[PDB]
Amino acid sequence: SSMKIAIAGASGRMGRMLIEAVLAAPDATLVGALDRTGSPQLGQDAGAFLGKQTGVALTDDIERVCAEADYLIDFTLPEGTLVHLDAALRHDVKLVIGTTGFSEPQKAQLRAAGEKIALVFSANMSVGVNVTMKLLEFAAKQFAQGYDIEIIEAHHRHKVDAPSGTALMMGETIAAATGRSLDDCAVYGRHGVTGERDPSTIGFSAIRGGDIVGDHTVLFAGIGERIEITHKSASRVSYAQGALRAARFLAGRDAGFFDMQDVLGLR
Amino acid sequence: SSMKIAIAGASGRMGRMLIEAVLAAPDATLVGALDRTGSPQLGQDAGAFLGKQTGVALTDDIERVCAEADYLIDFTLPEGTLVHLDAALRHDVKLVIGTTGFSQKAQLRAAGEKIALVFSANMSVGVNVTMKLLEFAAKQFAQGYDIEIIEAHHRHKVDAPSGTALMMGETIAAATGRSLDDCAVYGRHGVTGERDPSTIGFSAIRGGDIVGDHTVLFAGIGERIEITHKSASRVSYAQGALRAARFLAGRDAGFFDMQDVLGLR
Amino acid sequence: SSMKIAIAGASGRMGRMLIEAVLAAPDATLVGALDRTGSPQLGQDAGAFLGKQTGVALTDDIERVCAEADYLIDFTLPEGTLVHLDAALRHDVKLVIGTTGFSQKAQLRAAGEKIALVFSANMSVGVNVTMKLLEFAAKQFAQGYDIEIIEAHHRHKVDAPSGTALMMGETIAAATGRSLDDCAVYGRHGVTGERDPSTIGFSAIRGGDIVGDHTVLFAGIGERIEITHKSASRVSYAQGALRAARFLAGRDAGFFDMQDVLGLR
Amino acid sequence: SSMKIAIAGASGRMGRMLIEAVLAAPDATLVGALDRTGSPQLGQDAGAFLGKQTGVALTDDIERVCAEADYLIDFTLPEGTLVHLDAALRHDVKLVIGTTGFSEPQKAQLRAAGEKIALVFSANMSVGVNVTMKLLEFAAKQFAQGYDIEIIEAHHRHKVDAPSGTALMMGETIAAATGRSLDDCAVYGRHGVTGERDPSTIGFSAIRGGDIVGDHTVLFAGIGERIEITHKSASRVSYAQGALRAARFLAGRDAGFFDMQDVLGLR
Ligand SMILES: [Cl-]
Ligand SMILES: [Cl-]
Ligand SMILES: [Cl-]
Ligand SMILES: [Cl-]
Ligand code: NA
Ligand code: NA
Ligand code: NA
Ligand code: NA
Ligand code: NA
Ligand code: NA
């Protein structure tokens, strides 16, 4: 019953989180750990960073790892993942792709791959965030009248874009729940004489500082009451957890392109 | 076409909020303002406290009010409310009852044979909707999330945790066919050890004049999801009462609660 | 020995809260309840709305009230308040003024030559104390902490950020000899780039009937420290007014604010 | 002007955070990295976990590291730290000790050491927490009447003790600010008919779940208003930051036993 899993970018912060997750999962075993060709770390035990001698040495031999693994979990770089994709296809590996920054042709390449292998690709592998979108969708219909909708988001001192993509996705989900679009009703920050708030407005506030990983709150502010739905990310560790649920979903599947909506039965 | 609404206990704190909500609702008109025989406000314009003139004078005349109104919204006392019910029964009034609570509940379910009424102890849109949000969230986070319910109330609240927090617990427990009696931990203290993943832990904060905050925390590996309801005051029940009246506009007779009102059951 | 206190605008929302606070304070006694000539409540017991009998009947008689009271607490309108001030000047009343605001401030600083009075737009213990907490925190977190001020108010609030949030910013800026005009960023949106460590960023949330929440976040590497003030209603100003009266008990004449009252400057 | 710093337990999670902090600090250089004798990791570059070849190899030679370093930062184990202490004394090293679980004789050993070397020892190296205690002290005097004081604390699913030591320290600080003691006024959790709240009570609530590192809130609940002072720890990274401020304080000191109150000028 036990998933034979390889992890890509095994020396990276994400790869290390994925390794600790695989080791801890009772229904998975770590059988491969890849790092780039020429990495100083090649030859080290995958678990050396933690307490453990896993007996799995970091290697750059993509072919052997794909031969020996049934699953590869990959949160690295688009061109790196595409190299892994070709091996995954020839070796019939089930693939969980948490990498980001693909072009449209590359994304379509991943879908095409889904005709031959089973894979999950998602921009957000978090159980929490994906469920929160569905919660927001129900809340936006139930609170469609009498509630002013505000989206408040906090991230670290280096985030260059306001509001975050997650906040924007949340806004779109909320707008669509009543057949609207965001750019009709979105207000981004407020300064000066902003006047009476229009009841249809979706107001965004973007807080920035420290090393905050990402907090997102949707506030439904009514007359005499408030309802808040908040997601707090403490670290990329939550992506490792969703990646394993993705692997468990893929265990039942022969071929197909899937996202986290499929994995979580949300769609 | 606008709902012709009367308000009971009209010079009281809750009555005033109801009057405010009826005037502000663009589909409701105030036609009656009922108060006790012993009220010092009889004869005054229902809106005077707002500096408005409504054409509606506070009266103790239960009969005239019920004859003249299509709806009566009543958040008063059981005795006065049951007197109001008999008059509603005779005049075919759609009744919205925010009173709490009495044995007595039987008589007003029995009234639903002849008139349309809504009764609920919690007439807030927010709390009722939140209950259904928890049901979905409990199923979706059934694995990997430690569930904690945190509730805050005023310095005079005698019971912990709140009945609302308990309802949240039961809803959550039930969403996976469970009972709260199997998994509840209330106000932990001392050496409690490794938290069991199935536990629902309750925390009860007491102080000041906090009207009532309720948070359900789903605490997972690397992340947390929180669903919070904050009550600022009884004004939210006045908003819910108006939705109750709107629902009742379509109904001939029957006993209903906020679930029916909001289309949730 | 208990403070002999009169309340202005006694049948209004704020007047009622003041009456409540005076009765509840174990060192204060209600001796006067003043209202407008045009009030429909004259003659009624000041406590009737509470189901209490105080021995104090609502009157428009400014002269008698000031003659009979040692203190007058007044949160009404400038015109009525300035009429109240002249009577306080003639009867040596200790005046607590929550009214806002008028040009007019000059006359009531000038009144401090002859009587003892407190004037403040923000009569809350919590907000004034929080201001001094921020001063200490800004100095201690002067290096390594990004400072963000987050404020929430109701759907009708026209200005952003709130004046309170601005005062918090200025206090923080000043704690390191700085100006807010040098470092403030209000409502960021779009590509804003690397946050400058000196920036004080303001966020303004608007919706519902939120009375006013203000949070100062100190966001550091691995940790955050938050200092938050939440106003539920004007009842907190009634509490502050009573502390103002207590402070005034010791004073012969003089113009004072909440800083003096709470011993903060 | 640049502090020559060695880090103990260089393969541990804390040691790794301390290494990244030293590397990033503009006024410090990493000159030594210690790990236990027999560690598999001996010989590796201290920065291999990050992107960087620091040229500092992990070693178990305590003598050489203390000879070459001016500062040693040590968040390891009490018996390990005591071995380091003796080297620190013979080599005149400035010591920052973040280790915990010492006995009273051992603590007194650290103080005695302070006659010969300059050192910082503290149970909490966080700037945030230490400043928060002082904030709480001022707030407790200002809010001494009319405010119900509640302490709410959240930690991970494995914390066995409720409330946390930090919460208890917060309670004691608050009680002392009006000449009281905690065990006279503390109420720990609430269940059942608890009755009218006594205005002097300090009520504690302990929330448990997930991997929450530690949130602490003091609530001053008044009539018509609330004042909250909250400290959120995201990770042990904040201890690394306070350890460096400790090193900077120690740069000016020849000998002496110091804690974070000294380091931050709070006392
Ligand atoms: Cl707006
Ligand atoms: Cl009535
Ligand atoms: Cl008046
Ligand atoms: Cl208690
Ligand atoms: Na495993
Ligand atoms: Na209306
Ligand atoms: Na359940
Ligand atoms: Na009194
Ligand atoms: Na400053
Ligand atoms: Na450095």
Side-chain angles (χ1 to χ4, degrees), chain B residues 21-30:
Chain B
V22 170
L23 307 188
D27 61 337
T29 296
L30 189 66

Side-chain angles (χ1 to χ4, degrees), chain D residues 54-109:
Chain D
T54 67
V56 177
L58 264 49
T59 183
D60 71 323
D61 186 351
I62 294 160
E63 297 299 317
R64 195 182 70 238
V65 164
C66 289
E68 291 170 10
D70 289 334
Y71 302 79
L72 181 60
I73 304 171
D74 187 355
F75 286 64
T76 61
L77 312 147
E79 81 289 332
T81 298
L82 291 172
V83 168
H84 299 150
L85 181 65
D86 177 72
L89 282 156
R90 276 176 297 101
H91 290 281
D92 191 29
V93 169
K94 299 167 189 289
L95 192 49
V96 179
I97 301 181
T99 310
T100 51
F102 292 103
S103 73
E104 294 310 304
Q106 297 177 338
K107 279 194 200 72
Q109 209 174 122

Side-chain angles (χ1 to χ4, degrees), chain D residues 80-115 117-144 146-243:
Chain D
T81 298
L82 291 172
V83 168
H84 299 150
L85 181 65
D86 177 72
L89 282 156
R90 276 176 297 101
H91 290 281
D92 191 29
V93 169
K94 299 167 189 289
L95 192 49
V96 179
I97 301 181
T99 310
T100 51
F102 292 103
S103 73
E104 294 310 304
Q106 297 177 338
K107 279 194 200 72
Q109 209 174 122
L110 305 175
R111 300 197 165 82
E115 296 291 299
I117 59 169
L119 66 303
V120 176
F121 166 70
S122 186
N124 195 307
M125 214 81 96
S126 155
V127 183
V129 173
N130 287 292
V131 175
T132 296
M133 295 304 162
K134 282 295 189 294
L135 288 174
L136 291 176
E137 179 177 343
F138 179 79
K141 306 177 205 287
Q142 306 308 332
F143 302 137
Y147 293 83
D148 297 299
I149 304 172
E150 291 283 287
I151 298 178
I152 306 93
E153 152 290 79
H155 284 76
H156 58 85
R157 77 186 337 280
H158 312 291
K159 190 153 175 61
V160 308
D161 41 322
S164 56
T166 298
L168 283 185
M169 180 76 193
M170 285 188 178
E172 287 284 11
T173 295
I174 286 159
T178 71
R180 301 187 297 177
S181 177
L182 200 44
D183 62 297
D184 277 298
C185 64
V187 162
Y188 297 108
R190 290 184 174 93
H191 176 34
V193 177
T194 59
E196 178 77 14
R197 191 201 195 285
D198 184 284
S200 75
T201 292
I202 301 173
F204 289 84
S205 305
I207 296 164
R208 292 291 175 267
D211 57 2
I212 296 170
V213 172
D215 295 343
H216 298 85
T217 293
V218 182
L219 166 60
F220 297 86
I223 300 306
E225 66 177 359
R226 288 173 254 195
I227 302 90
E228 291 171 23
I229 301 185
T230 289
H231 180 284
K232 293 168 177 182
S233 184
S235 92
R236 287 175 272 145
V237 150
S238 73
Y239 303 134
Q241 302 297 120

Side-chain angles (χ1 to χ4, degrees), chain A residues 11-12 14-49 51 54-93:
Chain A
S11 293
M14 193 59 241
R16 289 186 297 109
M17 288 178 271
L18 288 163
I19 295 161
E20 69 179 2
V22 172
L23 286 177
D27 63 338
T29 65
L30 183 75
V31 294
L34 282 165
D35 206 0
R36 69 182 189 281
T37 293
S39 155
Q41 300 303 310
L42 293 185
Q44 308 278 115
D45 192 290
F49 81 96
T54 67
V56 177
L58 264 49
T59 183
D60 71 323
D61 186 351
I62 294 160
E63 297 299 317
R64 195 182 70 238
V65 164
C66 289
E68 291 170 10
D70 289 334
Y71 302 79
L72 181 60
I73 304 171
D74 187 355
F75 286 64
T76 61
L77 312 147
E79 81 289 332
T81 298
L82 291 172
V83 168
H84 299 150
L85 181 65
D86 177 72
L89 282 156
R90 276 176 297 101
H91 290 281
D92 191 29
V93 169

Side-chain angles (χ1 to χ4, degrees), chain C residues 25 56 73 94 116 120 156 159 164 174 194 217 225 241 248 253 256:
Chain C
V56 169
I73 304 171
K94 301 161 188 283
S120 199
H156 308 291
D159 48 299
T164 299
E194 291 286 331
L217 165 60
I225 303 91
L248 286 181
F256 308 105

Side-chain angles (χ1 to χ4, degrees), chain C residues 217-236:
Chain C
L217 165 60
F218 302 83
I221 299 310
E223 74 179 354
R224 291 173 262 189
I225 303 91
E226 293 172 17
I227 298 169
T228 293
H229 178 278
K230 295 176 184 180
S231 189
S233 75
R234 325 212 294 290
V235 183
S236 77

Side-chain angles (χ1 to χ4, degrees), chain C residues 187-204:
Chain C
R188 48 169 86 75
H189 53 282
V191 177
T192 49
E194 291 286 331
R195 198 200 189 273
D196 188 294
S198 70
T199 282
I200 299 164
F202 286 88
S203 296

Side-chain angles (χ1 to χ4, degrees), chain C residues 22-26 28-29:
Chain C
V22 170
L23 307 188
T29 296

